Symmetry: C2
């Protein structure tokens, strides 16, 4: 139902959710990302980035090149639907986005853009009723 979801990231380099569903009644959707580990952001920071599935690699690449001060996301990347900041163990961050950016029936990829994390930290997001 409600237009929110909580996802956990840890020191093992995993998310705890592999799929997220945004209910069709939602106009706004909020993702709460938590880092439940204890490692520093420079060593094991995590974020949550949303792109079309297609755009995964590219956004990941450019993000890595953007640096930590940019939360490992190329500024103004248009391929990026929404993203959180990079957070370390014990922290959390939230992002709220307009559902209208998503198109029904389409596949969206969410992943962590911190260097090298995208390969193990990825999931699918979809709009459904």
């Amino acid at each position: 139902a409600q237009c929110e979801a909580t996802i956990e990231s840890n020191d093992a380099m995993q998310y705890n959710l592999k799929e997220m569903v945004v209910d069709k009644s939602c106009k706004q959707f909020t993702v709460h990302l938590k880092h439940v580990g204890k490692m520093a952001k420079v060593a094991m920071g995590h974020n949550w980035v949303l792109t079309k599935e297609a755009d995964k690699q590219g956004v990941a690449t450019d993000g890595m090149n953007a640096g930590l001060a940019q939360d490992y996301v190329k500024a103004g990347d248009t391929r990026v639907i929404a993203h959180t900041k990079v957070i370390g163990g014990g922290e959390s961050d939230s992002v709220t986005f307009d559902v209208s950016k998503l198109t029904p029936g389409e596949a969206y990829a969410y992943f962590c853009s911190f260097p090298g994390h995208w390969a193990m930290m990825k999931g699918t997001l979809k709009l459904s009723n």
Copy 2:
């Protein structure tokens, strides 16, 4: 006996050895790194890099900026005692170095300098006793 060791790396971002000992009877030592997972190097490439414990973070930071083609290790890095190339699943690489670069009693760190892997893929190397 031998002045050689095999160390495995996998898709879970781990090495299978946490510590390595080089026998004092050795003049040279060879490390054979194997990537026994099935991920490709662009997503989960691994290397093996040896430095003094203290040069870890810096070598890693800078190897990261050298890129894949440079095996994620800055060329001519004086802090690097030895390193293999970056390999992907189903591949192996070997590196041999002089034992005399080592100092009896000292703990050296070995780790994977591929983006983001250092936090998890790290161990200790030293001389026999």
